[PDB]
Write a protein that binds this ligand. Structure first.
Ligand SMILES: NC(=O)c1ccc[n+]([C@@H]2O[C@H](COP(=O)([O-])OP(=O)(O)OC[C@H]3O[C@@H](n4cnc5c(N)ncnc54)[C@H](O)[C@@H]3O)[C@@H](O)[C@H]2O)c1
Ligand SMILES: NC(=O)c1ccc[n+]([C@@H]2O[C@H](COP(=O)([O-])OP(=O)(O)OC[C@H]3O[C@@H](n4cnc5c(N)ncnc54)[C@H](O)[C@@H]3O)[C@@H](O)[C@H]2O)c1
Ligand SMILES: NC(=O)c1ccc[n+]([C@@H]2O[C@H](COP(=O)([O-])OP(=O)(O)OC[C@H]3O[C@@H](n4cnc5c(N)ncnc54)[C@H](O)[C@@H]3O)[C@@H](O)[C@H]2O)c1
Ligand SMILES: NC(=O)c1ccc[n+]([C@@H]2O[C@H](COP(=O)([O-])OP(=O)(O)OC[C@H]3O[C@@H](n4cnc5c(N)ncnc54)[C@H](O)[C@@H]3O)[C@@H](O)[C@H]2O)c1
Ligand SMILES: Oc1cc(CCl)ccc1Oc1ccc(Cl)cc1Cl
Ligand SMILES: Oc1cc(CCl)ccc1Oc1ccc(Cl)cc1Cl
Ligand SMILES: Oc1cc(CCl)ccc1Oc1ccc(Cl)cc1Cl
Ligand SMILES: Oc1cc(CCl)ccc1Oc1ccc(Cl)cc1Cl
Lengths: 289, 288, 289, 288
């Protein structure tokens, strides 16, 4: 009764955020979507015109229930951080309460305390460039949006969460092993996110009795994954994974969703600070056959 | 759905095996216990006498359903492998079909194909000596009983398992970081088990679509734990409860619920992994 | 003959930069110091007034030879990055050619190509705050100065280095395991630096035949280490290390120096992308005695 | 300074043992070879006949100085441990004092205390089977000969070593990541060796101030390498030279110079570590 989850980073039904929502919905968790303002209106219109109705089907006797859909920009910690230009930008100007602190405030006012938090977002202006050719601005952009955003979400949401709550994010193995193509400091940001997950596990665990983990997911053809193409990257990764992983089956977003759902529930009470691989075991291989 | 799990390594209700059994029971999984022969009759006697009745309560509605309880010795792959001294032992002489292969055949003959396998056992005759003073015989005993036994279990059990079945074992972080009193080559055996888990994941995944993972548990005051010296387990528990990120008592069923998840279809995309279930203790460097 | 090493991050004789210089000097490597402008003048005056003469003694029949001492600020990639305020700041206004590109240009013009590069610097405005209380600005500051600086040094110095050159930086185990007190996103920056070391190893190795590694050093009572005190941290770490490390001896900066010197020489030709622990084995322990 | 190193595991000049010997020789370290008895006489014969003369050249001025060459079997801890079948073997019958303890005593009696120890040997009778089809006897053989042998070497050699001495062994990344043809429990043995290296580092560091590390080498076309199947070693080398960050031929002396550094006082603050000497291949995820 009243498991409520905020999922930060959903833009359509093709990413891991949607897979996580669907699996949580199956367990009767109420879902709140945090949607980045550049794609918020297109998301809502698609939703309203029933474009997602097929994608919301679960048991065939069961359909996803979404409690709310909120504009959310993980770039901004508080209203005071929003630069005048963004505030007046065409896509932002008609939206309110979209900073990290404001969304936490909003959620709490509307629904009270929550017990489940999902960071399912990343961004990097220079993802198309190799690390060596990444500018300082681009690298800091990657760390700001992909890594720091997790820390800030935690700082503001822990006030609206019950003890024994659970927090997950999503990472990629390029943090630990070299993946050519994963540029722009994205590798660096995932390494930071994985290390920050431990440090946060310590603070949140001791001061709040809240857990935090990260899922290192295998390749999924999401909207963001396609934007790694330069001049494709995700097709190569998928093909390589389906060919060489211990488990040669197609990796689904709901495969990640059911792990997320376990880590968010009380069943994972003794697990915290961990990077959990959900990648058909690809990470354990050294040399291909 | 008619799931069956063989749990190898139950001697009483104070260890991880029991906790795993309880949590699986919540999911209506049928449970079969593999019990080490030296403690088989005492176990059956305590069970008959009702000593375990309270430990078997799953909640208001439910009692643990235990399908069967069989003698099982991981020292022996097949009937041919038992020596005369064991053949002649008081405790073994009155039992049979307790080698790894015999138990696979016996389960398959009685109940058919299973789909869940749990390795929750270890042994090391020189556990109380430090690695440097461990003999070759002692070291190889630790590896034989604590590591090779997992390979052999897999080798014989795959024949009686369904596709998409799942397997787990238990390990300890002494494989990766030094724990002074974890002697007798137990640290070595755990290191080998964690690596074996990967290699097996490759073979079982490609050839049978079967998953295997290992749970690295924090300290639990079980029978075997009380055998280690610095008492060791009392120190480990106090340290964990003082310094772990989550300052709560680690329960066998905390491991049980993770095991149950790893053994279900929910974790279909996870294989070859060491999953830490230790209140986050493994992430700490410097005690604060 | 003409092994030349640029050591970026030396402010006095109490840190690892000095230890590395001393060990390299023992192998007749010519040393160039890159000195942060806020402490450059005080460094030079101390040096001139012979305050370091004791510290430069090697064999007792041998004294360190320093080829040059250059103002260096790893915050700035090129002259064009320097903000008007810094340029006119009291401590910067009389200094020139101190950006990463300008120092590379300068070194090359003056001495030709070099074959050894040391990143021995870190910085974080909010090191005194726990990760959870670190602001976005502070976290980005830590990543900018401690992590990105390595990438930029590489990008500009690879043009002035010979094939088969070697590059090292210094890291700390807080990247992998939680160390309370190592705040301000310093942990996050070290995690990034260690992951960037791999990615760079790949690019530099393939395109230039240049190696790069990082040394994860144990605790040393350097000037920066003392600035971690809040309201001390380094005294605790030293005491803990001397008590519980497999090797219970005092960790010296020249202990790190002799490893650095090995990794910079041709003897380590087949080692790249690695994090090498020089910490009396402390990292291998789980529970104290 | 009068340094002496025992190198256990030299059979010819094509392996890592020889490379380590050569590089140490550059530093004027006196070298003692431990040679597996089945290949001892053939080795001595090739040496006498000058087959190794060119491989022994250190440069313009220097030839490798080899202090002694002794039969050494890591299967056996003491004289008591040899079975009748080995006692009776053609190759062994004409040799003696080749158990681990006997060799420590023999070296100490002839040359005094040493300060450097190299473990450069492995064996696994079922290397050509995959882990899942490896027998208990085969698995334990791999662990006995490839892992326990390091512990035993340390146990017997510490008595004859100086304080601040240093010890190294060789491992392979198959302990950490799956390499399909690395069978017979060799992956398990390497996992145990890397963990054992840590535990030993604790014991030897606190008790004797002695260091121990392990070098994880990339592929070298040695005698033993040619025993593995997918040829395996030909594939590994081609893959490494194509995908490693450094695209250069890995030489035994590339491992040698790192070994020499780890065995010197230069690395006094390094212990219990796995050091990768593989042209950076281990850092790659996806072949590009
Ligand atoms: N797709 C893969 O193959 C893959 C593999 C490993 C990890 N991941 C991780 O999973 C997570 C989700 O990625 P995805 O693959 O589902 O792609 P996706 O496009 O479905 O998810 C990215 C979402 O984040 C949102 N977003 C971007 N910047 C934001 C900001 N500042 N504030 C709020 N929202 C913002 C975007 O609108 C987008 O909807 C990412 O962290 C990614 O690194 C993905
Ligand atoms: N207890 C802890 O603190 C702890 C921490 C980490 C990991 N573990 C692991 O969890 C597993 C379960 O142990 P536990 O802690 O529940 O103690 P336990 O005594 O409850 O379980 C060990 C069981 O293994 C059985 N066994 C021993 N030798 C056997 C053989 N040759 N064949 C068959 N069975 C044999 C014993 O009868 C015993 O019941 C072990 O593998 C242990 O390494 C335990
Ligand atoms: N001291 C330790 O215990 C310890 C342990 C592990 C790692 N390290 C690492 O070793 C490295 C050196 O630290 P240290 O301990 O020798 O302290 P230190 O003060 O001797 O070294 C830091 C130096 O970097 C310089 N610096 C700071 N910002 C700079 C910039 N933007 N451009 C150029 N130079 C700048 C400072 O002037 C200072 O001299 C750091 O990377 C640190 O993280 C230190
Ligand atoms: N060759 C490679 O590609 C490679 C890669 C990584 C690690 N390694 C490791 O390097 C080490 C050296 O092997 P190598 O590659 O030089 O091959 P090698 O054949 O040159 O060395 C192995 C030696 O071990 C000896 N040996 C075998 N059983 C023995 C016993 N019971 N007692 C004493 N000696 C015994 C053999 O006589 C042989 O000379 C091995 O431990 C191996 O695991 C090799
Ligand atoms: O992390 C990712 C890892 C993979 C490996 Cl298959 C594919 C997509 C990913 O997600 C992103 C990658 C880059 C950027 Cl800029 C944003 C995002 Cl959400
Ligand atoms: O693996 C273990 C780790 C700990 C750390 Cl708390 C405690 C108990 C353990 O289990 C055993 C330990 C030694 C032996 Cl001989 C058998 C077993 Cl079942
Ligand atoms: O990295 C470090 C690790 C330790 C652990 Cl003993 C001590 C000092 C360190 O160096 C710094 C720490 C913080 C900041 Cl702001 C700058 C620097 Cl140079
Ligand atoms: O460890 C090894 C790893 C590789 C990967 Cl290139 C090649 C050779 C190796 O050495 C052995 C391998 C198997 C056996 Cl039975 C003995 C030895 Cl000495």
């Amino acid at each position: 009764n009243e498991d409520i989850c905020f999922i930060a980073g959903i833009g359509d039904t093709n990413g891991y955020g949607w897979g996580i929502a669907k699996e949580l919905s199956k367990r009767n968790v109420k879902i709140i979507f945090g949607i980045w303002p550049p794609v918020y209106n297109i998301f809502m219109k698609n939703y309203k015109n029933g474009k997602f109705d097929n994608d919301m089907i679960i048991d065939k006797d069961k359909k996803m229930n979404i409690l709310d859909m909120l504009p959310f920009d993980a770039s901004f910690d508080t209203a005071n951080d929003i630069d005048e230009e963004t505030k007046n930008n065409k896509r932002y100007n008609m939206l309110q309460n979209y900073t990290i602190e404001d969304v936490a405030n909003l959620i709490h006012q509307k629904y009270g305390k929550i017990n489940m938090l999902v960071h399912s977002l990343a961004n990097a202006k220079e993802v198309q460039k190799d690390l060596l050719n990444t500018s300082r601005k681009g690298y800091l952009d990657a760390l700001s949006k992909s890594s720091y955003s997790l820390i800030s979400l935690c700082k503001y949401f822990v006030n609206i969460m019950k003890p024994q709550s659970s927090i997950i994010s999503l990472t990629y193995h390029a943090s630990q092993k070299v993946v050519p193509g994963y540029g722009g400091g994205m590798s660096s940001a995932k390494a930071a996110l994985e290390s920050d997950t431990r440090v946060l596990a310590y603070h949140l665990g001791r001061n709040y009795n809240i857990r935090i983990n990260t899922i290192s997911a295998g390749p999924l053809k999401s909207r963001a994954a396609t934007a790694i193409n330069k001049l494709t990257f995700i097709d190569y990764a998928i093909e390589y994974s389906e060919k060489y992983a211990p488990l040669r089956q197609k990796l689904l977003s709901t495969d990640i969703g059911s792990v997320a759902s376990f880590l968010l529930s009380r069943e994972s009470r003794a697990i915290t600070g961990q990077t959990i691989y959900v990648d058909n075991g690809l990470n354990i291989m050294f040399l291909p056959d």
